[PDB]
Structure 1
Amino acid sequence: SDRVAQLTIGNSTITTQEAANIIVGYGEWPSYCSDSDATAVDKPTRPDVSVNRFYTLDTKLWEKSSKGWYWKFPDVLTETGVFGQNAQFHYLYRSGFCIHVQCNASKFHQGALLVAVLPEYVIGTVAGGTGTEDTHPPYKQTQPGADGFELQHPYVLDAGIPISQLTVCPHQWINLRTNNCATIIVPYINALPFDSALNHCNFGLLVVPISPLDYDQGATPVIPITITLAPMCSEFAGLRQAVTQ
């Protein structure tokens, strides 16, 4: 009655019989931009069902040695379905997100994944190792797309900050002996009412194993982690030709 759940939006429905409730980032549901917060004057377009639906974008394999991965929003969807087209044809974009991370195993497997959302997740480099070289991360690392990217130094989140304090952000855990999914609802987070879906990534989704995956020889060794997400209250403005970046 808190373990079972159904998430229906658009022409897609998700089910889970081993949930752990739902998290609503910073305690507030997504919403459309009010006429007093807005600034751009053109009438926005709100596609609704064609873009506010669940998209399953990627599957990673959880291994005994995995370090963790991250994805950037809205980067992950800029080239998928109708949402992508609208993000490409419009200068302005804004929306919320419902993130559903899936990972099931057996009552004999163990391990725990920390699933968290970190706004304005700026990536840092190791500065040439000695820290005397001012290097910068490449586009494929700041905006990895749907395939995401693997963390090199999870302890410091590849940005000189302690992952041990990541729980100060909207998060959930996937502890195999307890639940097989994590659901986080995120409102639009920015210092502006609208912004570019291409140049700016509002937040990053981190999925990091804190307690290593383990099991005995003979049990299914392939344990996938699938990422499904749905935009909420998508709004677009500033129409012109399509642009990919």
Structure 2
Amino acid sequence: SDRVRSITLGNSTITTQECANVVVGYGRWPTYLRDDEATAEDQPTQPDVATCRFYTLDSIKWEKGSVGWWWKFPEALSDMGLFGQNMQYHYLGRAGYTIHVQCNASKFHQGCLLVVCVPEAEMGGAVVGQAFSATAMANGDKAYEFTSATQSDQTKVQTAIHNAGMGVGVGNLTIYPHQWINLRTNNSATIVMPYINSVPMDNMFRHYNFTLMVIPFVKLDYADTASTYVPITVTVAPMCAEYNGLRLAQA
């Protein structure tokens, strides 16, 4: 059967029994930087099993009125294991990622989720003109919530779900790598994202490589039942990570 998948990174393993296949970025597998494309002179450091492993983020509750959530990377993993330490102590970084999202429900539940990775997901402020600090879109591993109505507070991003905070049709996000979690036939989605950027490497604290979005396109529904909500969990694992430019820590 092709409905069973197993992934082993470092000292951690993920097993799923009901799952679609795996989407691989734009058809490119993560890989190390070549000698003919590098620009930095000194030797890189390639912590391997120490950093290339699965990390569980906090879990969220999926209610009947949920609208969606987003996370920004690698700021989400900025304070996780040795990956965070390497981010803090180095000037440049480079790594792919594997994202596994999990949502399980009985055969009597219905709903559909869209899981998509958006590279360079620049967002606009709630009030056109004013600006926001680096806290209305990223504060660690916590998830940020979309809104059904138009945002009004000037200190946060425009959370209109139908625009996705980018001024584009929410239904056109299919262009990016993605998968659907349909409770009828699926329980998890797996995406492998290669390193995508205009330069060989970059500061991991200054630049958000890509954004992960989960959007309910068919709201959750059920009847009777003692279960009041469906938890959603996100697991991520850097791949082929390497760093450079040892300075003092402290980002």
Amino acid aligned to 1:62: W
Equivalent in 125, 135, 143 of residue 138 of structure 2: 143
Aligned mate of 2:231, from 206, 224, 230: 224
Deviation, structure 1 residue 154: 1.3
CA distance in 1, matches of 2:173, 2:3: 25
Deviations 1:6-50 (A, max 9, x none): 111000000111101000011100011111111011110000001
Classify the secondary structure of the residue corresponding to 1:83. helix
- Ranges in structure 2 where 5+ consecutive residues have no aligned partner: 147-158
Tell me the matched-pair count. 239
Aligned twin of 2:200: 193
Q: Residue in 1 aligned with 2:129?
A: 134
RMSD of aligned Cα (Å) = 1.0
- SS of corresponding position for 1:139: coil
SS of match in other structure, 2:136: helix
Q: 1:141, 1:183 → 2: CA distance?
A: 27
- The question of 1:52 aligning with 2:59 is answered no
Deviation at 1:145, TM superposition (A): 1.9
Give the match's secondary structure for 2:181: strand
Mind listing any 5+ residue stretches in structure 1 that lack a counterpart?
Answer: 128-132
Q: CA deviation at 1:144?
A: 3.2
Q: Equivalences for 1:144-223 in 2 at 5 Å?
A: 144-151=139-146, 152-223=159-230
Matched residues in 2 for 1:46 and 1:94: separation?
10
Q: Distance in 1 between matches of 2:84 and 2:99?
A: 17
- Offset of residue 57 of structure 1: 1.1
Residue pairs, 1:30-41, within 5 angstroms: 30-41=30-41
Matched position secondary structure for 1:49:
coil
Displacement of 1:124 = 1.0
Aligned-pair distance for 1:206?
A: 0.5
1:233 paired residue among 224, 227, 240? 240
Matched residue, 1:130: none
Identify the residue that residue 10 of structure 1 maps to in structure 2.
Answer: 10
Per-residue CA deviation, residues 132-175 of structure 1 (Å, 9 max, x unaligned), is x4022331123232012112211101121111010100000100
One-letter identity of the residue aligned with 2:174: T
TM-score (norm 2): 0.93
Dislocated runs of 4+, deviation >6 Å? none
- Deviation by residue 1:183-240 (Cα, 9 ceiling, x = unmatched): 0000001001110110001000011101100100224122101010000000100001
Q: Equivalents in 2 of 1:216, 1:136: separation in Å?
A: 44
Larger proportion of helix: 1
Asked if structure 2 preserves the Cα contact closer than 8 Å seen for 1:70 and 1:207, the reply is: yes
Tell me which residue corresponds to 1:61: 61
Report the secondary structure of 1:208's partner residue: strand
Tell me, yes or no, if the aligned pair for 1:71 and 1:144 is still in contact at 8 Å. Answer: no
